[PDB]
Design an enzyme around this catalytic site. Structure first.
Site, PDB file in Angstrom:
ATOM      1  N   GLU A   1       0.816  -1.207   0.000  1.00 39.96           N
ATOM      2  CA  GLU A   1       0.000   0.000   0.000  1.00 39.96           C
ATOM      3  C   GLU A   1       0.856   1.266   0.000  1.00 39.96           C
ATOM      4  OE1 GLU A   1      -0.156  -2.467   2.290  1.00 39.96           O
ATOM      5  OE2 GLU A   1       0.316  -1.642   4.275  1.00 39.96           O
TER       6      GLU A   1
ATOM      7  N   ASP B   1      -4.913  -7.603  -3.850  1.00 41.16           N
ATOM      8  CA  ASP B   1      -5.526  -8.089  -2.621  1.00 41.16           C
ATOM      9  C   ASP B   1      -5.566  -9.617  -2.672  1.00 41.16           C
ATOM     10  OD1 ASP B   1      -7.376  -9.026  -0.699  1.00 41.16           O
ATOM     11  OD2 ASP B   1      -9.084  -8.189  -1.783  1.00 41.16           O
TER      12      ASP B   1
ATOM     13  N   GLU C   1      -5.758  -9.292   3.299  1.00 42.68           N
ATOM     14  CA  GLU C   1      -6.992  -8.762   2.722  1.00 42.68           C
ATOM     15  C   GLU C   1      -7.803  -7.983   3.751  1.00 42.68           C
ATOM     16  OE1 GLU C   1     -10.381 -11.360   1.286  1.00 42.68           O
ATOM     17  OE2 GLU C   1     -10.539  -9.735  -0.164  1.00 42.68           O
ATOM     18  N   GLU C   2      -7.922  -8.526   4.955  1.00 38.50           N
ATOM     19  CA  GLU C   2      -8.745  -7.868   5.962  1.00 38.50           C
ATOM     20  C   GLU C   2      -8.128  -6.546   6.386  1.00 38.50           C
ATOM     21  OE1 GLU C   2      -7.842 -11.190   6.249  1.00 38.50           O
ATOM     22  OE2 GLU C   2      -9.765 -12.259   6.182  1.00 38.50           O
TER      23      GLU C   2
ATOM     24  N   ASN D   1       3.401 -12.742  -1.553  1.00 40.88           N
ATOM     25  CA  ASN D   1       3.190 -14.191  -1.409  1.00 40.88           C
ATOM     26  C   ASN D   1       1.698 -14.524  -1.379  1.00 40.88           C
ATOM     27  OD1 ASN D   1       5.984 -14.608  -1.297  1.00 40.88           O
ATOM     28  ND2 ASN D   1       6.013 -14.512   0.952  1.00 40.88           N
TER      29      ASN D   1
ATOM     30  N   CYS E   1      -0.196 -17.900   0.187  1.00 38.14           N
ATOM     31  CA  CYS E   1       0.750 -18.642   0.994  1.00 38.14           C
ATOM     32  C   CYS E   1       0.439 -18.339   2.456  1.00 38.14           C
ATOM     33  CB  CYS E   1       2.188 -18.272   0.593  1.00 38.14           C
ATOM     34  SG  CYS E   1       2.501 -18.324  -1.214  1.00 38.14           S
TER      35      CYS E   1
END
Ligand SMILES: Cn1c(=O)c2c(ncn2Cc2ccc(CC3C(=O)NC(=O)NC3=O)cc2)n(C)c1=O
Length: 497
Positions: free
Chosen positions: A262, A272, A290-291, A404, A407
């Site tokens: 970001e 994302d 993601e969260e 990653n 993963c």
């Protein structure tokens, strides 16, 4: 600290961008504001002027619909009466939300909301919460029919369709999600949750950090309405490449074990690492990549209102979300740090120059499953869909900012996934900026493989056929992980040929 092409040589928006066409609504582009009145620094004006309602299987069911009923009375009238009460203790807010959610009055736990208010906040912080932030959130929530005047289509499976809406409209909708007002969302089994009730449940120590992050956003956008737009685009491709025959060369790579997608990937296509239900556990338990992004850029969360679960050939592209919070840590150590003043430039549609693509990797219950050719091709095609912008020259494509993908919890092999993303970016004709978040050995390993393959002039197809060789020769008949790892295999296979 980094290797490969200097990040300063990578393409970034807005400078690499093509001239945007005039924003206009069309059969595949819902636009919920007055385009003729869109002006920098002005709050966008909704179109149409007066609320128009659609209550069917093709659009969001709005809480302010006349068809939103309860035993028959107007549920919207009930919501207004419930939320227009003074809050002074957290039980007040629980009771208000349950007035129009009676069937869940025993199922929905509010422990985390009560504990945040009573056991985490200082007295003056709680006071600001119930005297200022919460009433201001109620008022923008209840303003919904004057703000989101146009029915919002669902971005259903196989639809290629964009929704462009104002940040102010997203703020009103997210305030409704917080107060759990969206009907029939508690026919939506293939959609993510949208109401915030799971944010209020349990005793996870990360719930106070999620709440601080979201209230930071709600305090900002109720104090001063944001003026920009956000576009949500569902993209599904019907045709995918013949990877074994692709003669395209690899593109450039910058790889580093410091920095973040970001911050250091500004103006780049930011990946994302999504759940197929976009946002994952943002408003429940999860707190990884993601969260975190959905919490610090909360306008991403409204994608859950209308984005059906992603199929294998699909992604969601969101342009214009604003960063409102800074954070430290990750997962169990995530903490809200402070408010963020987003300095991104805006494009000619008044969208922040921030482009995020949700692509969901597969979850591999067994490690070796991901080397099966159909599973490799699946991940290649998912990433390709996420990166491809049909009919855009490579000169006008920013680099991809990634890491990653898949993963950790999903069991992906970082070195395989790095190579898969590199191949997909090459096929979409974009450079790669890759963040390994402290893994310096992985940084060196990805750089060394990339420079080896590029210096030897291997095509996307050349590499893909080596991946198939690895499966057939070291994985297919494996008894145990294989004896030989992927990158050592590739080096030996190429050098011996
Ligand atoms: C994508 N990305 C990162 O990888 C990253 C990061 N900062 C550090 N790392 C690295 C890392 C990787 C795996 C784990 C394990 C793990 C856990 O310990 N607990 C869980 O609940 N889940 C988990 O996956 C922790 C830390 N940032 C800001 C980021 O954006």
């Amino acid at each position: 600290k980094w290797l490969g092409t200097p990040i300063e040589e990578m393409r970034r928006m807005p400078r690499c961008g093509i001239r945007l066409p005039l924003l206009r609504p069309s059969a595949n582009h819902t636009v919920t504001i007055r385009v003729d009145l869109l002006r920098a620094g002005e709050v966008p004006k909704p179109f149409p002027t007066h609320y128009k309602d659609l209550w069917d299987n093709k659009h969001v069911k709005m809480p302010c619909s006349e068809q939103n009923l309860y035993p028959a009375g107007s549920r919207w009238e009930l919501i207004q009466t419930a939320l227009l009460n003074k809050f002074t203790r957290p039980q007040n807010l629980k009771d208000a939300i349950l007035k129009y959610n009676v069937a869940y009055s025993k199922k929905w736990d509010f422990t985390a909301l009560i504990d945040f208010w009573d056991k985490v906040l200082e007295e003056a912080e709680a006071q600001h919460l119930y005297q200022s932030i919460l009433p201001d959130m109620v008022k923008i929530a209840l303003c919904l029919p004057n703000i989101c005047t146009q029915p919002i289509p669902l971005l259903a499976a196989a639809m290629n369709h964009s929704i462009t809406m104002s940040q102010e409209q997203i703020a009103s909708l997210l305030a409704n999600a917080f107060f759990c007002t969206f009907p029939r969302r508690n026919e939506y089994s293939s959609y993510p949750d949208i109401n915030f009730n799971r944010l209020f449940e349990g005793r996870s120590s990360r719930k106070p950090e999620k709440l601080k992050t979201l209230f930071c956003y709600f305090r900002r956008v109720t104090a001063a309405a944001p003026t920009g737009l956000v576009t949500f685009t569902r993209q599904s491709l019907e045709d995918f490449p013949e990877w074994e025959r692709c003669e395209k060369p690899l593109t450039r790579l910058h790889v580093t074990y410091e920095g973040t997608i970001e911050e250091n990937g500004q103006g780049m296509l930011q990946v994302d690492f999504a759940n197929r239900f976009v946002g994952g556990g943002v408003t429940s338990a999860g707190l990884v990549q993601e969260e975190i992004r959905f919490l610090i850029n909360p306008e991403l969360i409204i994608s859950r209102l209308f984005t059906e679960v992603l199929d294998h050939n699909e992604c969601l592209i969101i342009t214009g979300t604003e960063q409102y919070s800074e954070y430290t840590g990750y997962a169990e150590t995530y903490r809200w740090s402070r408010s963020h003043e987003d300095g991104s430039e805006r494009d000619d549609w008044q969208r922040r120059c921030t482009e995020i693509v949700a692509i969901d990797a597969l979850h591999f219950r067994r490690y070796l499953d991901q080397f099966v050719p159909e599973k490799m091709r699946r991940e290649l095609n998912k990433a390709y869909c996420g990166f491809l912008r049909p009919g855009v020259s490579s000169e006008n494509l920013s680099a991809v900012a990634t890491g990653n993908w898949g993963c950790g919890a999903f069991g992906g092999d970082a070195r395989l996934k790095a190579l898969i993303q590199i191949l997909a970016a090459a096929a979409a004709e974009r450079d790669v900026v890759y963040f390994t978040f402290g893994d310096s050995e992985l940084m060196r390993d990805i750089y060394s493989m990339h420079i080896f393959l590029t210096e030897r002039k291997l095509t996307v197809g050349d590499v893909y056929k080596l991946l198939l060789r690895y499966y057939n020769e070291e994985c297919r008949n494996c008894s145990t992980g294989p004896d030989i790892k992927l990158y050592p295999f590739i080096y030996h296979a190429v050098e011996s040929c």
